[PDB]
Design a protein around this ligand. Structure first.
Ligand code: HEM
Length: 154
């Protein structure tokens, strides 16, 4: 797939607002994932033990991991589709070391969309949401293709 420049501008305009508070957004997204799809917490040996939303909110390690996730994602989005080099080591660790199925990448995509809609309603109307969904679909398709090349396709 290919996004148009106008689609990329919608994506990078709301992302610019996200970057005003990377740690806050990172925490909101991971907590939303774990609340909506509890099975995903089981892939994180580091976080597995946390029982409640309050415990998640108070975890400094979970907040640090949120910053890592969004910084990596932001670097990929800023490439506007030219992300083959950035994607390779991410696909390799998530297929081979962490063993993350593509369905769970769909689940975090949903979580990102929910948080942006909640925090940025004026910059995340229907057309901006459609553009962000397309950007995340492009990411998912490319990571799936790399999974298959690597021997997982899970
Ligand atoms: C937007 C999609 C994602 C991005 C950008 C992302 C990015 C990252 C990065 C940069 C790391 C650290 C370096 C590495 O190990 O590759 C990491 C670690 C990890 N990711 Fe992801 N990730 C994504 C989705 C997921 C999903 C959906 C899951 C599981 C449901 C997941 C599970 C893990 C685990 C288990 C680790 C290791 C955590 C630890 O340090 O104990 N990732 N991820």
């Amino acid at each position: 797939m290919v996004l148009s420049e106008g689609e990329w501008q919608l994506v990078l305009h709301v992302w610019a607002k996200v970057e005003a508070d990377v740690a806050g957004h990172g925490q909101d997204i991971l907590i939303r994932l774990f609340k909506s799809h509890p099975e995903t917490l089981e892939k994180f040996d580091r976080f597995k033990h946390l029982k409640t939303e309050a415990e998640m909110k108070a975890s400094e390690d979970l907040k640090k991991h949120g910053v890592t996730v969004l910084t990596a994602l932001g670097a990929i989005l800023k490439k506007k589709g030219h992300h083959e080099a950035e994607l390779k080591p991410l696909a390799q660790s998530h297929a081979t070391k962490h063993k993350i199925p593509i369905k769970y990448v769909e689940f975090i995509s949903e979580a990102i969309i929910h948080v942006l809609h909640s925090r940025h309603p004026g910059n995340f109307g229907a057309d901006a949401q459609g553009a962000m969904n397309k950007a995340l679909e492009l990411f998912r398709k490319d990571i799936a293709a790399k999974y298959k090349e690597l021997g997982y396709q899970g």
